[PDB]
């Protein structure tokens, strides 16, 4: 049914694509981002790089959806000015450990032509401490894989077992490319893989060290979670109902460290920035975009703004986000050759996209995994430089107020976070007010050891938090926006 859609369709020969990349975490973002880059290459630049799409944990529905429409899916770009749709054809096979089985997945990863394994498994999928970037060796998912390394359940476990098998077969290693929203995401990937391999087999660890590269990336495209309204809107645009369809903004960026062991698609031809060092761009985007996103998510949700576009209708939230981007995030950056005021202006325009409904609740998810790179590293810069960080402090206070679990009208907030048990215990064991700040600050996996030991940070977050309690989020953002 998809080939009758009002959309651009795969005009290249799909059978001529080889499955050369295995992607872990077939979610909305991968579909609308990397999948689109690959499809442009297959369409315009004679690329034969196709994908095996694999889900290991959750995401059973996406995989099943593909399996009955010849692995095709729809991406619809939407903004105020235009919409466009594309039916993507680069997926050669879509697998799920719960459907096809783990052995089939490992076998696919051990085919000789697999050159890259890429990941969008969310920050929590790495089972690392957000504050340190290091593998949690005592995490039950990690210990279970370490005890049963040939039947792994984690992404790292699966990757390392695939590598063990390739090594034993005398097959070349693949490159492992994280596309998740962490600074130096290739270092995180390298570290967790290395720590894990060393825990099970030191010869395998050394071979991995000698044969695998872990290039870092920066990825950017706003892709809200797909709802029934999303699917209905894509149907209305294309004429065809696609359960695996995704809606996104027209903007896309992908910065890639050019360090691959077994080749790569010519992504630069589809608009990727292939460079030697991605870190300054990661920090730029994680801080100015994701940091402002998070600020808006907690303080917007608490004010009763359901979506980011709703936040942008409040001139104070608009001004606060802009001031946060340019006066607090931008000065912490080392990036060269970018007009950051213009970038900030463009982010506000992107947030104001009236064609998307990006829920503050969705962005608020997994705050424990996001705070360090999005806000806390910037705070550290300001602390070291004796510089003010008022809006960052309010952002942190906003997360703290949110995870208290009761909204300003006295209704429950459903908190989604892998550290929920720790967060709940911190909330339940502390009185509202100044005690609550102290208690949440004490979660070292989020705040590290320096920030809880920092009197200035503690004072500023506490002041912001007491303002949220006394005046609510909406009025507090208004106050801080002129401050
Ligand atoms: N606007 C966006 O949605 C953007 C997302 N990203 C990155 O992509 C990641 C995924 O985003 P979406 O696709 O929108 O989310 P999604 O919820 O649509 O997909 C999440 C994917 O991660 C997998 N996953 C979840 N927990 C896992 C675990 N413990 N182990 C292995 N796999 C796991 C799921 O199976 C699913 O395939 C984000 O966490 C972020 O790092 C990056 C830029 C923009
Ligand atoms: O936390 C989130 O859900 C958002 O801040 C990001 O997914 C944001 O949409 C992207 O990273 C922008 O590329």
């Amino acid at each position: 049914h998809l080939l009758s859609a009002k959309a651009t369709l795969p005009v290249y020969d799909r059978n001529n694509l080889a499955p050369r990349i295995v992607h872990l975490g077939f979610g909305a973002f991968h579909r609308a981002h990397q999948g689109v880059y690959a499809d442009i290459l297959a369409t315009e630049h004679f690329s034969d790089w196709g994908y095996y799409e694999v889900n290991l944990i959750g995401g059973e529905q996406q995989i099943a959806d593909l399996q009955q429409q010849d692995n095709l899916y729809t991406v619809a770009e939407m903004s105020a000015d235009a919409w466009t749709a594309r039916v993507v054809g680069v997926v050669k096979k879509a697998l799920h450990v719960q459907i096809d089985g783990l052995e089939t997945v490992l076998a696919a990863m051990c085919e000789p032509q697999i050159a890259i394994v890429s990941l969008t498994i969310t920050e929590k999928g790495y089972f690392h401490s957000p504050a340190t970037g290091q593998l949690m060796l005592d995490h039950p998912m990690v210990v279970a894989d370490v005890q049963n390394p040939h039947q792994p359940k984690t992404a790292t476990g699966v990757i390392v077992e695939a590598l063990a098998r390739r090594k034993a077969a005398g097959l070349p290693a693949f490159t492992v490319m994280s596309c998740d929203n962490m600074p130096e995401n290739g270092h995180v990937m390298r570290d967790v893989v290395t720590s894990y391999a060393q825990a099970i087999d030191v010869k395998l660890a050394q071979w991995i060290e000698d044969n695998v590269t872990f290039p870092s990336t920066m990825v950017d495209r706003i892709v809200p979670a797909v709802t029934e309204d999303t699917l209905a809107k894509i149907e209305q645009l294309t004429g065809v109902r696609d359960a695996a369809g995704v809606a996104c903004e027209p903007f896309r960026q992908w910065v890639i460290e050019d360090n691959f062991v077994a080749g790569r698609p010519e992504w630069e031809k589809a608009g990727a920035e292939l460079v030697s060092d991605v870190l300054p761009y990661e920090e730029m985007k994680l801080r100015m975009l994701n940091g402002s996103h998070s600020f808006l998510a907690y303080l917007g949700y608490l004010a009763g703004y359901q979506h980011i576009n709703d936040c942008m209708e409040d001139e104070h939230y608009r001004h606060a986000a802009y001031t946060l981007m340019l006066q607090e995030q931008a000065p912490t950056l080392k990036v060269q050759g970018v007009d950051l005021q213009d970038y900030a202006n463009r982010l506000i325009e992107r947030y104001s996209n009236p064609a998307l409904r990006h829920r503050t609740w969705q962005i608020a998810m997994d705050g424990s995994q996001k705070l360090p790179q999005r806000m806390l590293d910037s705070v550290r810069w300001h602390l070291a430089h004796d510089s003010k960080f008022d809006l960052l402090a309010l952002g942190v206070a906003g997360w703290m107020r949110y995870v208290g679990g009761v909204d300003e009208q006295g209704n429950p907030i459903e908190i989604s976070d892998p550290l929920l048990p720790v967060i709940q215990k911190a909330v339940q064991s502390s009185a509202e007010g100044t005690a609550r700040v102290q208690s949440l600050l004490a979660i070292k996996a989020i705040f590290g050891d320096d920030l809880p030991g920092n009197s200035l940070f503690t004072t500023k977050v506490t002041e912001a938090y007491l303002s949220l309690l006394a005046h609510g989020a909406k009025a507090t953002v208004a106050k801080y926006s002129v401050k």
Side-chain angles (χ1 to χ4, degrees), residues 113-159:
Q113 81 294 336
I114 302 301
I116 302 170
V117 170
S118 54
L119 301 86
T120 53
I121 58 174
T122 77
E123 301 91 340
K124 64 185 173 293
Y126 295 84
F127 299 102
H128 71 309
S129 165
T132 70
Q134 299 309 306
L135 183 62
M136 291 181 285
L137 294 167
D138 57 333
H139 188 292
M141 288 293 289
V142 177
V143 345
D145 276 10
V146 164
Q147 297 304 310
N148 206 355
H150 307 297
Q151 297 164 293
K153 295 193 159 67
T154 66
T156 291
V158 167
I159 285 170

Side-chain angles (χ1 to χ4, degrees), residues 204-246:
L204 173 61
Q206 193 62 69
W207 184 87
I208 286 176
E209 189 64 83
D210 295 336
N211 290 278
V212 178
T213 59
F214 299 90
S216 291
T217 62
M218 182 274 270
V219 299
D220 188 10
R221 167 165 261 190
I222 289 158
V223 186
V226 174
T227 63
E228 173 55 35
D229 291 328
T230 307
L231 296 181
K233 213 190 173 307
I234 293 172
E235 188 177 3
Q236 170 174 0
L237 298 170
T238 69
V240 175
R241 183 74 175 209
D242 180 5
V246 299

